[PDB]
Amino acid sequence: MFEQFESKFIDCDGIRTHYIEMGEGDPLVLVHGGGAGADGRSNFADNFPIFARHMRVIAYDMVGFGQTDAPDPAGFAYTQAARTDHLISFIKALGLSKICLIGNAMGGTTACGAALKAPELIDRLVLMGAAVNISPDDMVANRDDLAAVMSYDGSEEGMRKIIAALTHSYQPTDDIVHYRHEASLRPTTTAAYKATMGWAKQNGLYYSPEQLASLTMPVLVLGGKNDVMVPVRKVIDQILAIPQAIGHVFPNCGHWVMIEYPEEFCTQTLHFFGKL
Amino acid sequence: MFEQFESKFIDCDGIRTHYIEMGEGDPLVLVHGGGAGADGRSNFADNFPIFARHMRVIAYDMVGFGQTDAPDPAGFAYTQAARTDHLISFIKALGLSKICLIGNAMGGTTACGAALKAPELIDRLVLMGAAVNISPDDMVANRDDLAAVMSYDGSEEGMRKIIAALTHSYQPTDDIVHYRHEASLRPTTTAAYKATMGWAKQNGLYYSPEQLASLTMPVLVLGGKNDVMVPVRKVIDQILAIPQAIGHVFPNCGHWVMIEYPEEFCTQTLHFFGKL
Ligand SMILES: O=C([O-])C(=O)/C=C/CC(=O)c1ccccc1
Ligand SMILES: O=C([O-])C(=O)/C=C/CC(=O)c1ccccc1
């Protein structure tokens, strides 16, 4: 699946990184969600053609995910800072400056982190159901809805469970499910995933109110009103905690804003990027 | 001022009602704010040309306001229901059906009320810093920032105070201030205003969560993040209390969304109306 995009690869301080790209113009980098089997292709396939008509759009696979290297977690710690540093490295490896950047959930943690740490690279930020204020306690507090993703058994039913919980009125195709299931099952990505989630569960995906307020560039915060993974009140706190943030809440919409309402998602983001 | 629009008048069950209109296509009715001196012309002058390029746009003066009749409050009670019934009457007087409707603050109370009471007339609703969940206690709780409008002395400084509190980074022209000051001073509108606000202060501008949830048509809820009159948390509650509501929060923006960011306001509303 997803062979309509050309797989490309580049070295990011020793991490071999898969990405796809399309279109021309200013660079736009998309960062996918952190659930089992997720990658750039599968998260953003529906948005890519629309974005490509106006920008040079780019979706990479996060360290531990997809076709990017998944270093053995016997020797590699799967921390937020590792994702964050990976992203920063990726942007530099490609020679990109002044990017627009969109992050989904954990990809949102990562996009935020990179915006905090290397803001000179990033002109505009979009946080889409971003896990940027989810403490360890919040994880425990939302343990029931997070289980499908956090304690993923490795089964097909498990993957259907993950997607049911990422969505409000979206039926994925068998092909989508099969793709993420099969991807999830590679032994290296399985182990990197368990480490990834175990660390998330213990440490949270979190920045402090003061950290969020220090972001130096324009921000668009998006969220599905029915999102069970990053609940709308968390998205609302992000809007309030980030002085300059535009906020936009989507009704009849679960976590997967970009897939449930691909045109509206693209419209609102492209408009925010000055492309409409 | 505002003579670039043609004043027109029509009888709404014995209330003689001023309105302006422009453009062609589907009807769009705008309902102005309830502060001293407010009317359709002055609230929506900057938005009217933009809306006119795509819709038949219409701004009327609420009973007690502008150039609409201000019946003696010795014999007329200035209740929400009176505004609400006035609006419903206006829509019918004009023979309009399936309108798009936008209400600012008290104009928002009125637009909501009419959407609850006569939903068959209204295809789409926009609440812009709408006073639709402000209880008597909330009024008292926000008494300090509401004073400029609630206990308006009648002076020019008083009117500058009203506008400073309606805005975050907007300097109105002398002409805007003078217009609203002079309008505020007509003896009939002064008395209707005191009655209007006295009743607002005692009864609130309020609908119950259950009432809000019963709205039957699509809804767009807008709000300036720095709004001191209808604070952003109240706008956020509206978004959450209305299942189908889209939500959009504007940064660096006070109550007067339509004047501080006229293009963004028009863009977002026209998009929601299906005109972009
Ligand atoms: O496509 C996906 O895997 C996706 O959008 C996942 C979102 C879940 C996620 O990254 C998350 C993890 C822990 C807590 C909250 C959110
Ligand atoms: O232009 C205006 O007068 C305007 O936008 C006024 C808003 C204030 C308003 O109607 C209001 C009254 C009481 C409480 C909250 C809000």
C-alpha distance across the termini of chain B, in Å: 31
d(CA A140, CA A255): 19
Q: Mutual orientation of helices B106-117 and B80-93 as an angle, nearest 10°?
A: 70
DSSP H or E run through B265: helix B262-272
Largest CA distance in chain B: 48
Which residues contact residue B268 at a Cβ distance below 8 angstroms, ignoring those fewer than 6 apart? B220, B222, B248
Element (DSSP H or E) covering residue B237: helix B232-241
Q: Measured between alpha carbons, how far is B96 from B18 in angstroms, rounded to an integer?
A: 16
Q: What is the DSSP string of B15-81?
A: EEEEEEEE--SSEEEEE---STT--HHHHHTTTHHHHHTTSEEEEEPPTTSTTS----TTT----HH
Pairing of strands B246-250, A246-250: antiparallel
Give the whole-angstrom CA distance, residue A109 versus residue A112: 5
Q: Which candidate, B262, B206, B245, B1, places its Cα nearest to that of B125?
A: B245
Residue in A21, A199, A185 with CA at minimum distance from that of residue A96: A21
Indicate the residue of A225, A239, A271 with minimum beta-carbon distance to B249.
Answer: A239
Closest residue by Cα to residue B63 from B236, B222, B195, B175: B195
A244 vs B contacts (CB less than 8 Å) = 251-252
Residue B207 to residue B229: CA distance in whole angstroms: 17
- Check if A104 has its Cβ closer than 6 Å to any atom of ligand 1: yes
Number of domains in chain B: 1
Beta strand ranges found along chain B (DSSP E): 8-12, 15-22, 27-31, 56-60, 99-104, 122-128, 133-134, 205-206, 219-224, 246-250
Q: Yes or no: say if A116 and A214 are a contact pair by the CB < 8 Å rule.
A: yes
Dist CA A41 CA A47 (whole Å): 10
Contact A75, A66 (CB under 8 A): no
Report how far residue B254's alpha carbon sits from residue B269's, in angstroms, rounded to the nearest whole number: 18
CA A44 to CA B88: how far, in whole Å?
Answer: 45
Residues of chain A contacting B252 with CB distance shorter than 8 Å: 243-244
Specify the ligand 1 atom closest to the Cα of A36: 3
Both structure tokens of B221: 């809820």
Q: How far is B239 from chain A (nearest CA, A)?
A: 8
Contact B228 CB / ligand 2 (< 6 Å): no
Residue B187: both structure tokens together = 């003896």
Distance from CA of B65 to the nearest CA of A (A): 33
At which residue do the structure tokens 């905090």 appear?
A: A116
Q: How far apart are CA B229 and CA A147, in angstroms?
A: 42
Give residue A1's domain range: 1-276
Maximum alpha-carbon separation in chain A: 48
Cβ-based contacts of A248 with chain B (< 8 Å): 246-249
Conformation bin of residue A130: beta by default, left when phi > 0, alpha when psi is -120 to 50: beta
Nearest protein CA to atom 1 of ligand 2, as residue: B33
Judged on CB neighbours under 10 Å (0-12, 13-18, 19+), A75 is exposed
Among B273, B264, B262, B263, residue whose Cα is nearest residue B25: B273
Residue A255 Cα: closest atom of ligand 1: 5
CATH code for the domain in which residue A8 is found: 3.40.50.1820
> How far is the C-alpha of B98 from the C-alpha of B26, rounded, in Å?
8
Q: Write the CA distances from A177 to A170, A227, B75, B128, integer angstroms.
A: 12, 20, 68, 41
What one-character-per-residue DSSP string does chain A give? --TTS--EEEEETTEEEEEEEE--SSEEEEE---STT--HHHHHTTTHHHHHTTSEEEEEPPTTSTTS----TTT----HHHHHHHHHHHHHHTT--SEEEEEETHHHHHHHHHHHH-GGGEEEEEEES--SEE-HHHHHHTHHHHHHHHT--SSHHHHHHHHHHH-SS----HHHHHHHHHHHTSHHHHHHHHHHHHHHHHH-EE--HHHHHT--S-EEEEEETT-SSS-HHHHHHHHHHSTT-EEEEESS--S-HHHHSHHHHHHHHHHHTT--
CA-nearest residue, atom 14 of ligand 1 = A229
CA atoms of A157 and A153, how far apart (whole Å): 9
Q: Report the alpha-carbon distance of residue B132 to residue B211 in Å, rounded.
A: 10
Residue type, B140: V
Closest CA to B136 of B235, B58, B238, B204: B204
Nearest to B247 among A245, A248, A252 (CB): A248
Query: Which two structure tokens, joined as six digits, stand for A107?
Result: 């990809």
Do A262 and B252 touch, CB atoms closer than 8 A?
Answer: no
Q: Bridge-partner residues for B201, per DSSP?
A: none
Partner-chain contact B248 A250, CB within 8 Å: no
Inter-chain touch A248–B243, beta carbons under 8 Å: no
- Token pair of A248 as six digits: 């936009």
Angstrom distance (rounded) from CA A123 to CA A96? 11
Q: Is B192 left (phi over 0), alpha (psi -120 to 50) or beta?
A: alpha
CA distances A106 to A132, A165, B76, B132, B232, Å, are 8, 16, 59, 36, 27
Kindly report the backbone phi and psi dihedral angles of residue B64, in degrees, each rounded to the nearest multiple of 5, phi listed first.
95, -5
Bridge-based pairing of strands A219-224 and A205-206 is: unpaired
Q: Which two tokens stand for residue A264?
A: 């509206």
B202/chain A closest Cα distance in angstroms: 30
CA distances from B59 to B25, B38, B115, B162 (A): 15, 12, 17, 21
Cβ contacts of B190 within 8 Å, gap of 6 or more: B154, B184
* Paired tokens of B272: 């929601």
Q: Please write down the HEC assignment for all residues of A107-154.
A: HHHHHHHHHHHCHHHEEEEEEECCCCEECHHHHHHCHHHHHHHHCCCC
**Does the beta carbon of B166 sit less than 6 angstroms from any atom of ligand 2?**
yes
Instruction: Tell me if chain B has a CB within 8 Å of the CB of A178.
Output: no
Taking the CA of B151 as reference, the closest ligand is: 2
Contact of B211 with chain A, judged by CB distance below 8 Å, is answered with no
Contacts of A250 in chain B (CB under 8 A): 246
Distance B145 CA to ligand 2 centre (A): 11
State the amino acid at position A153 in one-letter form: D
> Can you state the angle between helices B143-150 and B156-166, rounded to 10 degrees?
130
Question: Which residue from A138, A206, A230, A235 has its CB within 8 A of the most atoms of ligand 1, so it is best to mutate?
Answer: A230
Report strand pairing: A99-104 vs A27-31: parallel
Residue (of A10, A22, A191, A24) closest to A87 by Cα position: A10
What is the amino acid identity at position A104? N
Ligand 1 site, residue A200, Cβ cutoff 6 A:
yes
The gap between the terminal CA atoms of chain A, to the nearest Å, is 31
Q: Which residue of B has its CA nearest to A240?
A: B225
Report which ligand 2 atom has the smallest distance to the Cα of B162.
3
Whether residue A240 and residue B252 make contact (CB cut-off 8 A), yes or no, is no
Give dist(CA B270, CA A216) in Å, integer.
30
